[PDB]
Amino acid sequence: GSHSMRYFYTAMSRPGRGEPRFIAVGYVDDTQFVRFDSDAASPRMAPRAPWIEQEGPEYWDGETRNMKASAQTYRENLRIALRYYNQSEAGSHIIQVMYGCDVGPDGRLLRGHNQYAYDGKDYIALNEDLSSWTAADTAAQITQRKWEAARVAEQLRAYLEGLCVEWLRRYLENGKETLQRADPPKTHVTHHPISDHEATLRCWALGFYPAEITLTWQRDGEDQTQDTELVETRPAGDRTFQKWAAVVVPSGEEQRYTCHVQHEGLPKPLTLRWEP
């Protein structure tokens, strides 16, 4: 299938409690592989997946350096952002960054991403063309003018089209046992009477990878999207994910309901019903 590499940075200020914390994590698809935390006893880019451990000292030292430099720059950016929004130095604020690349089955760049937020709201984003910017407000427009002046977009494009794709391909090859293996969901339906004339049907999907999945209830072949309780897909802790979808049905009408499961690991979509 297609794949993605993504990095997530969180820089959080904490006036009176030292310098802003910087945490970075890296992912291939739904698999985390590196971490950095400025609050660690000995801050460094550290492995979080077995297939990254084989990278040599140059990799880890380079990445550590890049992470510390990044942390400093984002502390400065927190100060700057304080200025741009006329905010006091007494409050805690957060800058977030998410970036990376998507490649197809042949390893070719599908597209790039490079997006920034301040206090949980869109700040500025590199457009899909990897050459122009979308700013969410006037402060972000100040940043945009700065970056247009310095041709930052070119450097980012150079990264996203070059190193990002190359190293993503490398990781996919080194971790092919896991990164290129889809685990299909194990599925089942449970039935719980809630009253004499109503019962809950719950369609379960467990142990699947990657996280992307679709669970839907149909009544007489018609989607019950509005009447379905759908929980957020959740991690099991063993790399796999879990999800369920529940519907409340009239007693004696259970067999008019079918659960439909779509997942990459399944050669064909599944249909299942309550089996008393």
Binding site: M45, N66, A69, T73, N77, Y99, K146, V152, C164
Partner: peptide, 9 residues
């Protein structure tokens, strides 16, 4: 591999 480009806002 992380991005080597991090600029001031």
């Amino acid at each position: 591999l992380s991005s080597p480009v991090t600029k001031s806002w």
